[PDB]
């Protein structure tokens, strides 16, 4: 009879895992402060890793990798890619990015301006985006002034002015991929991904109305007037997307996009493996990651960000959460056609 505790009540994902664990009749839930647990579904912030793996007779597991924030923080990811030889500053699948601190506080203000002026002089497209509340502009003066008005670190990266547009609609989109890393550091990619599409036509002559540039489900369902027109909830799944790529582009999702995604997932996770692996550690870690990608008109895949506490598409909670129990939990606490793709090392 295995035991576990829950320390993030707002997690839709592990709320389902917690619901499935009890359904097996072989798992018991303890108060969130009881230390005699086998499994911790811990908080997002200030997870007390230092108190794990010190209970005699209990093999303890946790659903977060200590140190993964280096990958899931906007500023950290920029620094990690530039300073890691495994990724190098010449990394081809990540938009040119710079870490910029507000003047009221190293910083790459001058380094950014140099690349900016280079584009302004070369007649090239010089439209960047700021984020940490987002601002898209082609003038460097606006981007820096918007950051100083705030009080937190910001990141300015090149805005993909040539995004791949679905048809009909002439609309942008981003791809979300769920990746699970188990205690042995096998990298599993969920066979099911989602496209978060913009229900508005892409217009490169007006970065003021951010509803056709930002594909967030929250911005589309609140500020967009064509919500749920082409697909239910501005969410297209791989089956439909792949059929589209065959009809319009005579190619497959695997060849044109998925190979690049798998290569990006591998590169990021294998890079930080020495820093976060729990192989020879007194406790074990696993974690679910949400990778966000962009696709340009050349069918090149770009990495946007990595989410450490991702949610899931309502239509995919059942399959995914069960797969989290099979490969991540039951593999350490066994019970009395996999849905994942092994990209590990």
């Amino acid at each position: 009879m295995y035991t576990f505790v829950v320390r993030d009540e707002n997690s839709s994902v592990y709320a389902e895992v917690s619901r499935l664990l009890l359904a097996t009749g072989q798992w018991k839930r303890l108060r969130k402060d009881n230390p005699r647990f086998n499994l911790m579904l811990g908080e997002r912030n200030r997870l007390p890793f230092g108190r794990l793996g010190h209970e005699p007779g209990l093999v303890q597991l946790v659903n977060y990798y200590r140190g993964a924030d280096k990958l899931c923080r906007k500023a950290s990811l920029v620094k990690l890619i530039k300073t890691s030889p495994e990724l190098s500053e010449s990394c081809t699948w990540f938009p040119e990015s710079y870490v910029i601190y507000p003047t009221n506080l190293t910083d790459e203000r001058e380094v950014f301006l140099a690349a900016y002026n280079r584009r302004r002089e070369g007649r090239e497209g010089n439209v960047w985006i700021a984020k940490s509340g987002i601002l898209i502009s082609s003038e460097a003066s606006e981007l820096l002034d918007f950051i100083d008005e705030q009080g937190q670190v910001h990141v300015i990266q090149k805005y993909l002015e040539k995004p791949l547009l679905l048809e009909p609609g002439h609309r942008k989109f981003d791809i979300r991929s769920w990746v699970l890393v188990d205690h042995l550091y096998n990298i599993y990619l969920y066979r099911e991904g989602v496209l978060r599409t913009s229900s508005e036509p892409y217009n490169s002559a007006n970065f003021q109305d951010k509803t056709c540039h930002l594909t967030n489900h929250c911005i589309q369902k609140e500020y967009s007037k064509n919500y749920g027109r082409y697909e239910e909830g501005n969410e297209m799944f791989f089956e439909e997307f792949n059929q589209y790529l065959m009809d319009a582009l005579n190619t497959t999702l695997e060849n044109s996009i998925l190979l690049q995604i798998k290569h990006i997932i591998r590169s990021c996770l294998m890079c930080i493996e020495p820093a976060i692996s729990t192989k020879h550690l007194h406790y074990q870690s696993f974690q679910l990651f949400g990778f966000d990608f962009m696709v340009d008109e050349e069918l090149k895949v770009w990495l946007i960000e990595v989410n450490g506490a991702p949610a899931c598409a309502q239509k995919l909670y059942a399959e995914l959460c069960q797969g989290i129990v099979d490969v991540a939990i039951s593999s350490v606490f066994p019970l009395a056609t996999s849905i994942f793709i092994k990209l590990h090392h």
Partner: protein, 438 residues
Amino acid sequence: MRECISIHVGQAGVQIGNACWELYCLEHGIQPDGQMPSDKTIGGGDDSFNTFFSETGAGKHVPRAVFVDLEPTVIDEVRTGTYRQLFHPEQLITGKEDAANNYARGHYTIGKEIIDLVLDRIRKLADQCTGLQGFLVFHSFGGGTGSGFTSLLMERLSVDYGKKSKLEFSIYPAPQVSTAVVEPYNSILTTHTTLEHSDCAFMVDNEAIYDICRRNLDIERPTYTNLNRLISQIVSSITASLRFDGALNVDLTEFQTNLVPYPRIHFPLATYAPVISAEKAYHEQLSVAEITNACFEPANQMVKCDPRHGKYMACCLLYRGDVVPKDVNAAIATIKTKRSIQFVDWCPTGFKVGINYQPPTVVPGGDLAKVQRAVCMLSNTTAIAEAWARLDHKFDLMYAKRAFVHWYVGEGMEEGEFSEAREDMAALEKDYEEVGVD
């Protein structure tokens, strides 16, 4: 030559002391009767080993050590044991009844009535030293004597020997080999009143020693004898620079200068390798690179914690055996490219290295195998704060209900000392976070 006086307080300190001097004698060729054939200067001499051993006219080499326990059971083992002849009776001090795992009982009640006697005996050893460096204090966190009486003894030593260095070897409590539920109280109480009096303290978590014995030595249920022989190997590696000719950590002051840039953060993490079982019929000897690499594995640290998520302030490599500098640097280069070693910005990113050609000595019939080379790494990592967090957490659970507090108050301690000692630990935790995290 400057002498070092060792003080062993409580059961853990005394039994660990027994293991160390057994080792020191084997290392220096001293027989149990105190004789040392290799010593050609009879009755005296200012050799390196004389920092720990004095000499009588009859050629006996006597440890510069004091054993103190509030109950006689453990020290009586020394009086009639193998090394009964090493010490004279003045060096073995015992009371009638112990502190009952109660800090306040050891510090106030019983401590007040035997503190002056211990100092007088220590004064006797001090009067035999032409240039005393300081003291090495062995004790447990959890015991009522190890915690309560040590903190009082440290206060007085700072009074009677102000310009002297004081180092600690402290046993951090571990439930797998403990039967006292109040050890979190005693640990925090003694760290509070001892913090300003210790220049450098090496914590040894029994949970770590216990697992190394089960994992590397294949001991199903390790005893105190198993644990203490391993602990004395680490202690020997740390004190070797004081007992043998050398140029690194040659006096107690160098431990602070090399390992403690900030006075409160004086708890270096110790890592030792290799630990090979003597019952192992077949063993492949590890290289300089392999044992140096093992110094960055949590499984051989004296305290389980993840230095990958802390920052280093200092780092010492103490090798014993067949090791030359060339191989050390080669292993260090390879480890920097593969390991997560982050130094604070206000510190150089380097390593002070020490090599003693004499390989580690192993007690006949002991559990450890004779290896051709070993290393002990002393690094001041902020990651060691994990041990304070765990301990402080257990303190908070019990103190929120005032559980067991009446035992301490009944011994004359004021309840406010609990919260006072707890807020100091909260500051110690904050200081670590200020130095390490960004």
